Every structure is written in structure tokens, then in C-alpha cells.
Amino acid sequence: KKGSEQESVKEFLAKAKEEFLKKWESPTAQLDHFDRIKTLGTGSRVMLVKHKETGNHYAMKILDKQKVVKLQIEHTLNEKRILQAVNFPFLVKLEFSFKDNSNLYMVMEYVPGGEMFSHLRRIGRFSEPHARFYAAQIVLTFEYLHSLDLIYRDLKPENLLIDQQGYIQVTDFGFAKRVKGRTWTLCGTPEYLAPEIILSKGYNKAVDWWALGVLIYEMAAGYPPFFADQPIQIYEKIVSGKVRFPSHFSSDLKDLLRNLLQVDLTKRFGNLKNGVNDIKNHKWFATTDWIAIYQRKVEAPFIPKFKGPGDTSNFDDYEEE
Amino acid sequence: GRTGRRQAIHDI
Numbered sequence: 378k379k380g381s382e383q384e385s386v387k388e389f390l391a392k393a394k395e396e397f398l399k400k401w402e403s404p405t406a407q408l409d410h411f412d413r414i415k416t417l418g419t420g421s422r423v424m425l426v427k428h429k430e431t432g433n434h435y436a437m438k439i440l441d442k443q444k445v446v447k448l449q450i451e452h453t454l455n456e457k458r459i460l461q462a463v464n465f466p467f468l469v470k471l472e473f474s475f476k477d478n479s480n481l482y483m484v485m486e487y488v489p490g491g492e493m494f495s496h497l498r499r500i501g502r503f504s505e506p507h508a509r510f511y512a513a514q515i516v517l518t519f520e521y522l523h524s525l526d527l528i529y530r531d532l533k534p535e536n537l538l539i540d541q542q543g544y545i546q547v548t549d550f551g552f553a554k555r556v557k558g559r560t561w562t563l564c565g566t567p568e569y570l571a572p573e574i575i576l577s578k579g580y581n582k583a584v585d586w587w588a589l590g591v592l593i594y595e596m597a598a599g600y601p602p603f604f605a606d607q608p609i610q611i612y613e614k615i616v617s618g619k620v621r622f623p624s625h626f627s628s629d630l631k632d633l634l635r636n637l638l639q640v641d642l643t644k645r646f647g648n649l650k651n652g653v654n655d656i657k658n659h660k661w662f663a664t665t666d667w668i669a670i671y672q673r674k675v676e677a678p679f680i681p682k683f684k685g686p687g688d689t690s691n692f693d694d695y696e697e698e
Numbered sequence: 699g700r701t702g703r704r705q706a707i708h709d710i
């Protein structure tokens with residue numbers, strides 16, 4: 378039975394790689410086709426827009442060529458090329474992309490449930506079954522991406538949107554990269570960086586598994602495991618090899634997290650002979666029906682409220698520029 | 699620790 382399940386994963390990934398490669402090797406609209414509505418998020422912006430012809434709403438990522446000045450540029454090409462070639466239930470869909478004299482634009486499906494980040498900070502923490510439901514989707518998404526030699530490199534609740542079924546949509550592929558062995562760019566978000574990134578070591582997809590450990594801890598605790606006011610203090614905590622857990626964490630959860638938040642790459646789950654199955658077959662996931670999650674048959678822990686098309690009530694406000 | 703949204707870092 379587990380043998381049948383493993384053969385079926387092999388089959389699915391072989392077909393997924395064939396489809397990805399067709400689009401990867403052979404990868405529009407214009408700005409006046411959309412009414413800009415509201416900024417949904419911003420960083421070093423994404424706007425809700427409304428397509429004038431069809432009335433459909435989208436999330437438009439706008440990249441200022443005057444800001445993307447850092448050697449930033451490769452990462453932007455990675456993002457567009459990867460998003461146009463992947464296809465998975467928990468990855469945001471890219472619809473259009475175009476550019477003008479000032480900006481690059483990627484137009485994606487609008488996911489109106491808001492960021493996991495908002496919901497988590499509002500309620501404080503998620504119970505373990507609630508956290509597990511989200512974590513299972515990330516596990517499957519990384520099994521898919523890594524099989525295509527893609528590393529994601531920016532997992533955190535800010536980048537996980539909740540859709541109308543209560544499932545996750547992974548957004549922001551700005552640091553995602555196709556990597557056949559190791560890569561060397563120092564990039565990511567401080568609380569979620571693996572030790573080998575901070576230590577300026579060439580690294581591989583195991584940094585995404587470390588970051589899953591940070592995410593599961595933060596979802597279940599309400600704060601991440603390496604927590605300080607300044608990035609340099611965070612980095613010292615990450616490289617030490619020490620993690621402490623809330624007293625309400627189950628022992629199964631602590632065991633899984635000790636194996637993800639493992640500084641020694643010869644021991645870190647996701648990075649061993651059995652690959653992702655050390656994670657999928659861990660006791661903390663014993664209740665998880667992996668195929669039922671993929672097929673979206675599992676009832677979600679909560680469904681965000683929506684008042685209609687173009688509703689932005691589940692997002693925070695930002696200064697409009 | 700930092701409780702608001704966290705910015706990614708693109709180089710060192």
C-alpha cells in the first residue's frame with residue numbers, strides 16, 4: 378500500500394516534469410487594460426486591479442525598474458519564467474505579464490482571503506490540526522517544486538494567501554530559482570533563513586525544509602523559533618543549534634521540528650535518503666490524507682468571509698503612490 | 699522580536 382502510494386507519486390511527478398519543461402523552454406496585456414483599485418501589499422507593490430473588458434479582478438505586481446537596481450534583476454526573470462511554467466493547486470496562477478518604460482507587471486489571480494500572516498497575528502496561534510492542514514499543503518508544494526529542481530527560498534506567513542475554500546495559495550516567487558545542485562545568493566527573510574545561508578555556504582533545496590520547520594513552529598506558537606529585534610541577533614540564534622518549544626507543543630510536533638530545524642545537513646529531514654517521505658510519514662502527519670489534501674477534499678479550518686467580487690476587507694491598508 | 703511584516707533581504 379505505501380509501495381503503491383510511492384509509485385503513484387513517482388508517476389505524478391514524471392508527468393508534472395514533462396508539462397513543466399514544455400512551458401519552461403517556450404515561455405501579455407497592457408496597463409490601460411486595467412483599473413487600479415487598491416494596494417494589497419508592498420515591499421522593496423501588489424495592487425488589486427479590475428480588467429476593463431471582462432470586469433475580472435486580478436492582483437497586479439508592479440516592479441519599478443528604477444528600484445530593481447541591484448544585480449534583483451536575475452531574480453525578477455526567475456520569478457516570471459517560473460510562474461509561467463508551473464501548475465499546482467497551491468501555487469498562485471500567473472495570467473498576464475508585460476512591461477513599459479517604467480515598470481514590469483505580472484498579473485495573477487486575485488486570492489481575496491488575505492495573508493495567513495494577518496489571520497495568525499489576529500488570533501494569536503493556530504491549533505495543531507489547523508497548522509497541520511496548512512503545513513501539509515506546503516509539504517506537497519515543495520515536493521512538487523523540488524522535483525522540478527526549483528527552490529522557493531521565501532516561505533513565511535506573509536507570502537501565503539488564503540483562498541475562498543480556506544486553502545493556501547503560495548505567492549511571491551521573487552527568490553525562486555531553478556538549481557540543479559547548489560546556489561550561493563544570500564537572500565530570504567532573516568527569521569526563516571537556514572544556517573547554511575547565513576554562513577555564506579553554498580546551499581540546496583534543504584533550506585526550504587528548514588524554513589518549513591520555522592513556519593510550522595510559528596503557526597503553532599504564534600511567533601517564530603529564532604526571535605529578536607535585530608537581524609544579527611536572529612542569525613546568532615539560528616546558527617547556535619538551540620531551539621526551545623512552548624509547553625503546549627505535542628511531543629510529536631517537537632520531534633518533527635527538531636528534525637527540520639536541524640543544523641546538520643546530514644541529519645535534516647527532507648535532505649536524507651528517503652527525501653520528503655521522512656516528513657510525510659512522520660507521526661505528526663499520521664492523520665493527514667495527502668491525496669485528499671491535494672484533491673481539496675478536506676474541510677478547511679476556516680473560510681474567510683467575502684462580501685463579493687473585488688472585496689479587499691481581508692487585507693491591511695497601505696499608502697497609495 | 700519583530701511582530702510586524704518582515705522584509706526579505708536580497709544580498710548580504
Ligand SMILES: CC(=O)Nc1cccc(CN)c1
Pocket residue numbers: 384388
Ligand atoms: C497509462 C499510464 O499512464 N500508466 C502508468 C503510468 C506510469 C506508471 C504506471 C505504473 N502503475 C502506470
Ligand SMILES: CC(=O)Nc1cccc(CN)c1
Pocket residue numbers: 417418419423436469485486487488492535536537548549
Ligand atoms: C498575487 C498576490 O496577490 N500577491 C500578494 C498580495 C498581497 C501581499 C503579498 C505580499 N506577500 C503578495
